[PDB]
Design a protein around this nucleic acid. Structure first.
Ligand SMILES: Nc1ncnc2c1ncn2[C@H]1C[C@H](O)[C@@H](COP(=O)(O)NP(=O)(O)OP(=O)(O)O)O1
Ligand SMILES: [Mg+2]
Ligand SMILES: [Mg+2]
Length: 428
DNA sequence: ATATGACGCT
DNA sequence: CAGCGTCAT
């Protein structure tokens, strides 16, 4: 007990934008605000594929991975915004630039780790220490949008009434005399996150949600508990009851094959049930690293650091050529490699100017018709010049021998995907 | 017919 | 300037 680590050393937050692509389009087009709206890419096939949905539209059952024509059946008044198309492909520049707006604001408060186009982890341990040294009870007024997971226990017919009662129980209990209380550190962390989220909304117009806990996995989980436009504090103490009915697939990194194996091999359904197994038992089934990770995680402990990185490590461009449209001619493959290369060149040139770095490697990936893998083959070559013509020519050079066609003009088996990625950045 | 990113394994 | 698999938004 006296020597058992509790994973309460850090204060970490995960901030995730609410229906991000939609909010970007709603800021731009006021007509879309406060309406059932979705963002779609490529209109010709079934109205386009939905990639983002406003909360108003979710109420009708509209989801991502849904064709717009089908979404309209569920929600006839659904409004749509289209992703920009350039050179025959979706262009996500608007969303990347909006992402930068948000990341730069977050970086003012603390070290952050860009985790996706719309979320970042924040290591608030130091900021909390400074704020505690600076502060004195914490008023509920400092936590206007915060939920305390697990509370209240023991006006509650409405959600805001429930939120306040839980917050009151939490604050009434808080021991502010001790600067080392983990619960107190989380609370101060939540105050700072309120301030961060206020700054994001004020300076960008975008709303977001956040999770505050002692590690990245719990912070991420916490974030989704009360979306949209709210933040949730998950304390170490809230873990046993939270994990008691938490499907294993809900924890980050367990949503795939590993997660399925955990369920199948151990015959369990919830994250908390993992506590019954010894570390060695878990390592035997899932490997040394996964086993140790699972053993600590089911107890609410994780040590993965918030990495000091707010810029992407790679810059890539990709396009699918489904079914009948699979590229079947050499000239066809070269023309598309050129479109991808030109987009990549623009993005790389801007990156070099903004971030004082240059990519030194080019990775080319493709999918062959009949293969359900994300990638069928991957090859690389030196990226010595930011020249689209050289990059597309080099990319063809490295994959051209995959062509099994006896005939020079033709390409077989036809390609269902092209991917160009710039990597191995070096200071410039 | 359904654009990206990180990172682990070998 | 290795190539493939997994998990993610
Ligand atoms: N599978 C995918 N394909 C393409 N784009 C994707 C996508 N998943 C997400 N996006 C893009 C579009 C998304 O807007 C953006 C953020 O991803 P989230 O955070 O997962 N989802 P959102 O922010 O929309 O809603 P909220 O968080 O409130 O639930 O990334
Ligand atoms: Mg989001
Ligand atoms: Mg997200």
């Amino acid at each position: 007990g006296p020597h058992m680590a509790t994973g309460q050393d850090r204060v970490v937050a995960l901030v995730d934008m609410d229906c991000f692509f939609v909010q970007v389009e709603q800021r731009q087009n006021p007509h879309l605000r406060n309406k059932p709206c979705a963002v779609v890419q490529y209109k010709s096939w079934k109205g386009g594929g939905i990639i983002a949905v406003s909360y108003e539209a979710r109420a009708f059952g509209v989801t991502r991975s849904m064709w717009a024509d089908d979404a309209k059946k569920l929600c006839p008044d659904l409004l749509l915004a289209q992703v920009r198309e350039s050179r025959g492909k979706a262009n996500l520049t608007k969303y990347r630039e909006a992402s930068v707006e948000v990341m730069e604001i977050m970086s003012r408060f603390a070290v952050i780790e860009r985790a996706s186009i719309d979320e970042a982890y924040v290591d608030l341990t130091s900021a909390v220490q400074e704020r505690l040294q600076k502060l004195q009870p914490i008023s509920a007024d400092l936590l206007p949008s915060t939920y305390i997971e697990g509370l209240p226990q023991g006006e509650t017919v409405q959600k805001e009434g429930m939120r306040k009662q839980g917050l009151f129980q939490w604050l009434d209990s808080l021991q502010i005399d001790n600067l080392t209380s983990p619960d107190l550190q989380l609370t101060v962390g939540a105050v700072i996150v309120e301030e961060m989220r206020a700054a994001i909304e004020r300076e960008t117009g975008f709303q977001c949600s956040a999770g505050i806990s002692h590690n990245k996995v719990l912070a991420k989980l916490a974030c989704g508990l009360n979306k949209p436009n709210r933040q949730t504090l998950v304390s170490h103490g809230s873990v046993p009851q939270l994990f008691s009915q938490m499907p294993i697939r809900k924890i980050r990194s367990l949503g795939g094959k590993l997660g399925a194996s955990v369920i199948e091999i151990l015959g369990i359904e919830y994250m908390g049930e993992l506590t019954q197994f010894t570390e060695s038992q878990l390592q035997s089934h899932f490997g040394e690293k996964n086993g140790s990770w699972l053993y600590a995680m089911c107890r609410g402990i994780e040590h993965d650091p918030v990495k000091p990185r707010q810029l992407p490590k790679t810059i890539g461009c990709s396009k699918n050529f489904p079914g009948k449209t699979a590229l079947a001619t050499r000239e066809q493959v070269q023309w598309w490699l050129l479109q991808l290369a030109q987009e990549l060149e623009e993005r790389l040139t801007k990156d070099r100017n903004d971030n004082d770095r240059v990519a030194t490697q080019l990775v080319v990936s493709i999918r062959v018709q009949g293969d359900k893998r994300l990638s069928s083959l991957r090859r690389c070559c030196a990226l010595t010049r930011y020249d689209a013509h050289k990059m597309s020519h080099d990319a063809f050079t490295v994959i051209k021998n995959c062509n099994t066609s006896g005939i020079q003009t033709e390409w077989s088996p036809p390609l269902t995907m092209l991917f160009l990625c710039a990597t191995k950045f070096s200071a410039s």
